[PDB]
Design a protein around this ligand. Structure first.
Ligand code: ZN
Ligand code: ZN
Ligand code: ZN
Lengths: 349, 446, 216, 636, 87
DNA sequence: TTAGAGAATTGGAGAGTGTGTTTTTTTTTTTT
DNA sequence: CACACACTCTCCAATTCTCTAA
């Protein structure tokens, strides 16, 4: 079988290199080992816990931290911003067959798992994006101004022949142009074709527009903006007005409309998303770990917990203990209810 | 093989060469290699050291230095600028490869500053097309930065040969013969976006500056195009000197090609195969290779501070009674009011802003109010402060706009949608806002 | 293909026997053929529709219910044809002016818990879904052709009773008989039905926090 | 792909500026050799290894840092020889179908990469140190094998066509070939080549060293190379400025002629005219639409397009354009020519002719022989001329050898249709050698030595006494074809014919020379009347069309021969042709006509004779239209 | 259909060809000694016009290149020796 | 030995086919 | 739709290959 290697030395480009079978298999094995052997500072096997917390909720999406991927596997962190589409596909396959080792029946729940990269250190201001960043993984921040609805996009399309029953085999749909068959292999009729709507595989699609946050640099100047594409589970990760933090591949393609608008061979650009966080929702219950729950529930055992919480609100303000108490009660809030299913009363304070 | 070892194997060579442009190339390479500064040796070798950085690709060259090198060369560059410009870029590439750390695919650009003659916008006639030209104008609108395909790399779909360095002009042009000499294909090509080369691209609308505007005439506007390092350096409202060349840009919507189809009051030209039965119009665009203002951090301070400035600020720091010295120097027109001068000086120096452990800010800026009769020097203090300091703003309490001291919300008919017009305090962000007639605000601002 | 026609005929026969044989009740009280009697009374009233419960179909023949859940577009046509022929044998002989048999619309319902609009991901495509909501807009009733006849414009030959696919999807006219587009659709010799598009807003209870309500 | 990738990656890893080799790297390179020996016909392993850049990445560091490991080193040398093998040898011939021509181009591209990589001086430093040890040792089968493979590696790296799309480089910017030559100079392998050529102990390598030298000199020509003094850089700076100035002034003048040709009104400024005295293609008068300023210099083909001449009818074109090598490389190459001519020429050329006699040379190695016979002889003629350093090739044997080779190439050009262009390029080399021998026998008459004057008279007497050297020019002119031979061939042929006729004129006018070949009588003008043929004048006019682009010496030669053929032989009517008259019209209407005084005066002379004949009778206009045989005597 | 002219010997021996070329210079006049350039310009103008009338499809130089080859053929050559002298 | 007439091969001109194409109501913020 | 791009397909004829007479 294909033999293991030192990965970082090669004569090819990075994309070509990770596309070749030998290093692809080595990368696959390395990421598999990284998932199955990475540990926390305290020694907790991180990704066993994360995969269990994923498979419990059927979230079919595994979040990975770059700042420890670089710690464990160097060359994977090296190739990732340089050839992100290829390496992320390899990561998806490796993560899938790790998850099907931990939970063998999980293929009943989902046939594909996406690896989402977080805490990417090469952050970029939104107006500072240039041709130097093309086809590379970037991280940017901005307020979502617009969103399409969640729409079905073709991913693996089978075409019915225009004159007979035959289904032309799967074409992998792109984000650049609508892939087409040309002519049928069973009988070389050509031109228009019908999509087999039942056997064709679709994926969720949502296109968002993000611009610079109003208070960041737009001091009377107009803000710059970029389009981003969310696919599969990333849809509904954000709404208009959300101060998101977006990781994605900065991707470009030919656009005739821009060419005629500018009078130059100007290529449109879009961010193929790979992770969406929010800069106000810095913590969420879907991200809490077992250790966080354990130390929270240990703190609740203390009889001083009420006083600790009251003292913990705005600690740089002296006095105003009644204010801190009232703000704590409002910050935690009461319980909403609807007795009889016909009479609502609010829980908020 | 025989001594006649060349059947023209694999050759589609240039059967003729632009003599003038190549002479310009070699002589400009000699200029870059041999022109020397008075305080040392070989100025542009030292300036070309900076081009190994990932973001840097442009060398800024002084046209008067080129004239001091040779007048005939400078005249030829000025007269034949657009013709010779890619050859000058090749000369710079040949010059900068000796640093040995450059990527092989990296493009380099030449940018001529210090052009002696400045033309008005009215003088940009068709006779100026292709010539090196300097203009002054006020920027009106700046569009987003885009990647522009400078040269495509294409794959031939029926013999799998790659074709590199396909120059573009204006319509997106795929190659028109295959590089493989025996291959018959002239239409079926695929762009390799990853191995193609792009440059940063921006277009900005300028207009005639205030000094140049003729009496009783509408301001004339011009589309300037900036590339590579110049793609955000000029912002709307700035008065900037642009150097580059006036070019003609076709109506690209009218041109059909093997790459892409057409996309469809004056007559225009006719008769081209690519144009079909349509007619092609033209418009003038200033392709700016350089931009500068028309009149101009701790690391930045440490680099900028020359030895005289270091000694001056050190002597000032050790100056006893620097308090009264700075009060007198900053407010010489003011008689008396030493306490007020001291207070406003402390306002200029300001306190330390701080952030609490809970991510909540503590104010560092102080605020000073000067109450007085309309006959006194209260306005004089504000005028001296705003004349002195950079980034400061002067305003009345009453607003000269829909936005006042603080922002206001206004529709724009470009979208019929609400946006924020900035107020004086935001324009004075990280600075000083001098507010005369402070007692007579509107309720919104107050 | 004869194998395909055999499959369609077998599934149609199974739906036919479901509508012919399904009963509710007990031997202690009695039995009523629910869907037979519903078909008979609705046809005699001139209603020409019935409401087949998915749970009843599952109890009679679970495979039919599973097929109708996974591939409703394929199997609802067979179910409607089965209902048509069951109505024929249940109602005939009919009086004068009622000799021609009418098509039957087989609506269907379920006791299952419903899904939601935001739960409708891509993998739910072409399956049966059950979602709640509020109607915010309703189109005026418009005519959609279910069968058409097309006549060649040049030589006046005719192709008749071409079956139109249901839903908003259309039909591609042939480019061979003459010109490249030889045909026009005959406005008299075609059969049409009422159709109406609606907008179904997500329930306010179902909107996640901070979101605008979706609509389908 | 996978097995080849595993085996090549197995060799070694590179750390900064150092290379660390894995212990089984010898077996790894042996495996790579095994794969190369079992390629597909598409040269798939060569393509894949070139794509992987294993040569640059692994073999060059191994060569430059692990040459002490001799069993690895010789395997690495053989592997590099196999990888660098020229594409024409890899495929046997230049392909003619798209797929295999693409494969050829891909292999050629990787050869470009190899040539660019080998310019690193350490490679040739190691090669020169090794070959120095080997030639000190020189002797074993393995030793001479290693010498042969080192020389073949140098041959291979020198012999690649430069991809001038990427090597689109200006007048004296250092090309890849220039950098390779400079690396050879710095490594001192040029001294080893000089030692091999000068030494009599190992003459079997003389043929290979001749090939190496012939591949070293490709852009250069001896007349320019010999004149490169130490102060040439400042001179060329001023020359470049002057050339740019005159080019710009010429372009400005051309612009103003075009501007005055068209009017000062815009394009759609209408108005139409009738020329009452000029019939259209119909019966009515011509209606003209392009304005009075186009009528001022009216031509009846203003609106027309050129004709699409078919592929089989199109003329041949030059395969090269004269970019100079860098000035340092030019100085090194001049010094190499000096040392080669002084120390190496006679022994090496005798050894190569001995190789041809022994007939172990390859099928076209006499092309290299004739290349050197042209090049270094012309280098000797330039600057200080000394026949003593080059005495060997002045023998009449070389004239006979050139004549038989040239006639053989001529016959193969006329018969071998599929390879006719290459045979034309070989015939051009033979013609150039013949021209240079005519030049040197002309030159040595000016020398002060009576012995070499005696040798010159001997050579001239036997060469003009033997007829086959004399009739060859008529054969070449009679079967010259622009469709196969470039304009440089015709230029060299005209120059050679002018020189040969000049020397024959001088010899016959200073000595009797009364018999030729079995003796038969001979006079000079009888031979000159052979050139009074339609084909000869047609070819001369064909070269005359490019009078602006021709050198001043070429214009002097062509006008001198045509003036001789028209005036002294009294056959002006042979040169009366309408294409020739169009050429004269462009020549007389040239703004630069003052620079071509001899040409314009000759044109006016022949035109005056024509108009005398036309005044005699109207038949001259009809006779002017068609090329014409010996019946021209009616017109005269 | 396909009524494309060819410019072969039948075209050259037509009325517009050599029979016309025998006569086109009857109106012409020349200055002679010391003005051969002007006489050449008039000569080429007249024969260029004749070429245009004979076969308008080609440029003049291309027409000359065609005809200088085409004169070798026997039909036009016999018509040439008829035009030379007289029938 | 050189040049013209009959037969063979391939370029491309032309026919056919397929495809492409101000003005009113309602809201929101700010101007007086 | 009737008036323009883009592609395929057909037969005419333009130029060369080969045999013969001058
Ligand atoms: Zn089919
Ligand atoms: Zn191709
Ligand atoms: Zn019909």
């Amino acid at each position: 079988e294909s033999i293991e290697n030192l990965e970082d030395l090669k004569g090819h480009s990075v994309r070509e290199w990770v596309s070749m079978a030998g290093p692809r298999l080595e990368i696959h094995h390395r990421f598999k080992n990284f998932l199955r052997t990475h540990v926390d500072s305290h020694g907790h096997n991180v990704f066993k816990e994360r995969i269990s917390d994923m498979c419990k909720e059927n979230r079919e999406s595994l979040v990975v931290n770059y700042e420890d991927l670089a710690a464990r596997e160097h060359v994977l962190a090296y190739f990732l911003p340089e050839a992100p589409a290829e390496l992320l596909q390899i990561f998806d396959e490796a993560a899938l067959e790790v998850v099907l080792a931990m939970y063998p029946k999980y293929d009943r729940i989902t046939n594909h798992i996406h690896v989402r990269i977080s805490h990417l250190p090469l952050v970029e201001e939104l107006r500072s994006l240039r041709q130097l960043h093309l086809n590379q993984l970037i991280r940017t921040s901005g307020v979502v101004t617009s969103c399409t609805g969640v729409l079905p996009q073709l991913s693996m399309v089978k075409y019915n022949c225009n004159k007979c029953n035959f289904v032309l085999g799967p074409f992998c749909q792109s984000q650049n142009q609508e892939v087409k068959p040309g002519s049928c292999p069973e009988c070389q009729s050509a031109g228009p074709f019908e999509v087999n709507m039942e056997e064709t595989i679709y994926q969720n699609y949502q296109r968002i527009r993000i611009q610079e946050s109003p208070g960041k640099v737009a001091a009377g100047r107009l803000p710059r903006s970029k389009d981003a594409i969310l696919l599969a589970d990333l849809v509904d990760s954000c709404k208009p007005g959300d101060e998101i933090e977006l990781t994605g591949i900065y991707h470009n393609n030919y656009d005739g409309s821009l060419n005629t608008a500018n009078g130059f061979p100007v290529f449109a650009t879009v961010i193929l998303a790979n992770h969406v966080a929010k800069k106000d929702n810095k913590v969420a219950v879907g991200e809490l770990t077992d250790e966080d729950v354990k130390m929270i529930t240990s703190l609740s055992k203390d009889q001083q917990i009420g006083e600790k919480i009251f003292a913990s609100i705005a600690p740089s303000i002296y006095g105003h203990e009644d204010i801190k108490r009232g703000l704590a009660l409002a910050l935690f809030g009461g319980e909403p209810k609807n007795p009889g299913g016909k009479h609502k009363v609010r829980g908020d304070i | 093989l025989a001594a006649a070892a060349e059947p023209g194997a694999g050759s589609q060579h240039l059967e003729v060469r632009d003599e003038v442009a190549e002479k310009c190339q070699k002589l400009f390479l000699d200029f870059l290699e041999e022109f020397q500064s008075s305080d040392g040796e070989i100025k542009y070798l030292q300036l070309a050291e900076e081009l190994i950085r990932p973001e840097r690709n442009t060398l800024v060259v002084s046209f008067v230095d080129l004239e001091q090198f040779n007048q005939q060369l400078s005249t030829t560059i000025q007269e034949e600028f657009y013709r010779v410009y890619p050859y000058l870029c090749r000369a710079l590439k040949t010059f900068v490869k000796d640093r040995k750390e450059i990527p092989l695919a990296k493009d380099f650009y030449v940018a001529f500053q210090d052009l002696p003659t400045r033309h008005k916008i009215r003088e940009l006639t068709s006779s100026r097309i292709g010539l090196l030209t300097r203009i002054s104008g006020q920027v009106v609108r700046t569009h987003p930065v885009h990647p522009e395909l400078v040269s495509g790399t294409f794959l031939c779909l029926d013999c799998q040969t790659v074709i590199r360095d396909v120059e573009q002009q204006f319509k997106y042009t795929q190659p028109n013969i295959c590089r493989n000499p025996v291959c018959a294909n002239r239409r079926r090509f695929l762009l390799d976006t990853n191995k193609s080369r792009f440059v940063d691209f921006q277009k900005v609308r300028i207009q005639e500056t205030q000094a140049e505007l003729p009496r009783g005439s509408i301001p004339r506007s011009l589309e300037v195009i900036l590339r590579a390092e110049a793609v955000e350096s000029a912002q709307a409202g700035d008065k900037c000197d642009f150097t580059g060349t006036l070019i003609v840009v076709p109506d690209v919507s009218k041109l059909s090609t093997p790459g892409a189809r057409a996309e469809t009051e004056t007559e225009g030209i006719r008769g081209l195969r690519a144009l079909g039965v349509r007619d092609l119009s033209y418009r003038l665009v200033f392709l700016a290779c350089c931009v500068a203002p028309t009149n101009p951090t701790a690391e930045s301070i440490k680099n900028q501070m020359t030895v005289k400035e270091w000694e001056k600020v050190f002597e000032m720091s050790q100056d006893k009674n620097l308090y009264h010295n700075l009060c007198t120097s900053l407010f010489p027109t003011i008689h008396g009011n030493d306490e007020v001068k001291r207070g406003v000086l402390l306002m200029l120096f300001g306190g330390v802003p701080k952030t609490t452990g809970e991510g909540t800010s503590l104010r560092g800026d102080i605020n000073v109010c000067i109450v007085g009769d309309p006959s006194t020097a209260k306005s004089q203090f504000l005028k001296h402060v705003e004349e002195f300091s950079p980034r400061a703003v002067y305003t009345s309490g009453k607003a000269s706009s829909a936005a006042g001291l603080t922002a206001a919300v206004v529709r724009d008919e470009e979208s019929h949608e609400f946006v924020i017009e900035a107020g004086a305090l935001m324009l004075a962000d990280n600075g000083v806002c001098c507010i005369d007639e402070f007692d007579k605000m509107d309720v919104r601002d107050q | 293909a004869d194998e395909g026609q055999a499959r369609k005929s077998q599934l149609q026969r199974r739906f036919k026997e479901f509508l012919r044989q399904y009963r509710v009740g007990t031997d202690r009280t009695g039995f009523t053929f629910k869907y037979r009697d519903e078909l008979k009374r609705h046809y005699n009233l001139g209603e020409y529709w019935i409401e087949v419960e998915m749970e009843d179909l599952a109890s009679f023949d679970e495979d039919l219910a599973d097929y109708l859940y996974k591939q409703p577009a394929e199997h609802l046509q067979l179910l409607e044809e089965a209902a048509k022929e069951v109505a024929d044998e249940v109602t005939r002989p009919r009086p004068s002016g009622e000799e021609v048999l009418q098509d039957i619309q087989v609506m269907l319902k379920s006791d299952a818990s419903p899904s939601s609009i935001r739960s409708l991901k891509s993998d739910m495509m072409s399956h049966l879904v059950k979602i709640p909501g509020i109607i915010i807009a309703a189109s005026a009733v418009r005519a959609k052709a279910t069968r058409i006849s097309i006549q060649c414009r040049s030589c006046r030959n005719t192709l008749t009773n071409i079956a139109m696919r249901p839903g908003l999807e259309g039909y591609a006219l042939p480019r061979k008989c003459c010109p490249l587009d030889p045909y026009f659709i005959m406005p008299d010799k075609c059969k049409c039905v009422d159709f109406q598009t609606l907008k179904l807003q997500e329930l306010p209870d179902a909107v996640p926090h901070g979101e605008m309500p979706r609509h389908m | 792909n996978c097995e080849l990738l595993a085996t090549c990656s197995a060799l070694g890893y590179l750390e900064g500026d150092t290379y660390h080799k894995e212990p089984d790297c010898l077996e790894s390179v042996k495996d790579l050799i095994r794969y190369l020996r079992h390629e597909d016909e598409t040269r798939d392993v060569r393509q894949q290894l070139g794509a992987a850049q294993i040569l640059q990445s692994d073999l060059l560091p191994i060569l430059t840092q692990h040459h002490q490991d001799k069993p690895l080193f010789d395997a690495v040398i053989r592997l590099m020889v196999n990888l660098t093998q020229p594409a024409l040898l890899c495929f046997g011939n230049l392909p003619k179908e798209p797929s295999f021509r693409h494969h050829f181009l891909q292999v050629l591209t990787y050869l470009q990469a190899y040539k660019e990589a080998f310019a690193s001086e350490k490679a040739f430093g190691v090669l020169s140190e090794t070959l120095y040890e080997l030639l000190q040792l020189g002797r074993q089968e393995e030793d001479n094998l290693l010498i042969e493979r080192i020389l073949l590696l140098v041959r291979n790296i020198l012999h690649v066509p430069a991809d001038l799309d990427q090597e689109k480089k200006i007048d004296d910017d250092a090309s890849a070939h220039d950098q390779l030559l400079w690396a050879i100079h710095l490594s001192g392998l040029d001294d080893l080549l000089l030692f091999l050529a000068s030494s009599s102990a190992e003459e079997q390598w003389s043929l290979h060293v001749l090939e190496i030298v012939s591949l070293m000199f490709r852009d250069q020509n001896p007349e320019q190379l010999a004149g490169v003094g130490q102060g040439r850089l400042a001179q060329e700076r001023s020359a470049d400025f002057a050339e740019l100035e005159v080019l710009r002034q010429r372009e400005m003048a051309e612009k103003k002629t075009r501007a005055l040709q068209r009017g000062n009104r815009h394009s759609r400024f209408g108005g139409s005219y009738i020329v009452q005295g000029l019939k259209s293609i119909g019966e009515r008068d011509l209606i003209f639409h392009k304005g009075l300023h186009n009528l001022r210099n009216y031509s009846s083909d203003l609106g027309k397009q050129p004709k699409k001449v078919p592929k089989r009818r199109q003329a041949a074109r030059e395969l090269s354009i004269q970019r100079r090598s860098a000035l340092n490389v030019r100085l090194f190459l001049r010094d190499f020519c000096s040392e080669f001519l002084e120390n190496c020429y006679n022994r090496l050329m005798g050894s190569v002719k001995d190789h041809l006699l022994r007939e172990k040379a390859q099928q076209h190695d006499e092309t290299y022989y004739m290349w050197a016979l042209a090049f270094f002889m012309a280098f000797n003629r330039a600057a200080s001329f000394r026949p003593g350093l080059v005495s060997e090739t002045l023998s009449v044997r070389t004239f006979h050898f050139i004549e038989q080779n040239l006639t053989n190439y001529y016959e193969m050009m006329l018969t071998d249709r599929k390879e006719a262009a290459s045979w034309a390029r070989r015939m051009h080399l033979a013609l150039k050698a013949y021209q240079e021998l005519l030049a040197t026998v002309n030159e040595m008459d000016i020398s002060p030595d009576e012995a070499v004057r005696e040798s010159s008279r001997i050579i001239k007497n036997n060469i003009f006494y033997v007829m086959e050297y004399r009739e060859l020019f008529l054969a070449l002119f009679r079967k010259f074809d622009e469709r196969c031979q470039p304009r440089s061939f015709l230029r060299d042929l005209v120059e050679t014919t002018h020189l040969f006729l000049k020397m024959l004129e001088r010899f016959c006018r200073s000595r009797g020379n009364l018999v030729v070949q079995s003796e038969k009588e001979f006079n000079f003008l009888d031979y000159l009347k052979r050139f009074a043929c339609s084909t000869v004048v047609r070819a001369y006019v064909l070269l005359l069309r490019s009078y602006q682009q021709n050198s001043a010496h070429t214009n002097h030669c062509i006008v001198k021969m045509l003036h001789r053929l028209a005036h002294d032989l009294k056959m002006e009517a042979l040169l009366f042709q309408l294409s020739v008259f169009c050429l004269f019209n462009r020549l007389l209407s040239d703004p630069a006509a003052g620079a071509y005084k001899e040409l314009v005066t000759f044109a006016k002379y022949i035109l005056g004779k024509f108009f005398a004949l036309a005044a005699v009778n109207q038949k001259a206009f009809v006779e002017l239209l068609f090329w014409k045989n010996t019946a021209v005597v009616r017109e005269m | 259909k396909r009524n494309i002219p060819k410019l072969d010997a039948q075209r050259l021996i037509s009325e517009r060809g050599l029979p016309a070329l025998r006569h086109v210079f009857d109106k012409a006049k020349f200055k002679g000694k010391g003005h051969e350039a002007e006489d050449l310009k008039m000569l080429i103008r007249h024969m260029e016009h004749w070429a245009h009338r004979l076969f308008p499809k080609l440029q003049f130089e291309d027409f000359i290149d065609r005809v200088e080859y085409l004169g070798s053929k026997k039909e036009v050559q016999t018509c040439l020796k008829r035009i030379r002298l007289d029938l």
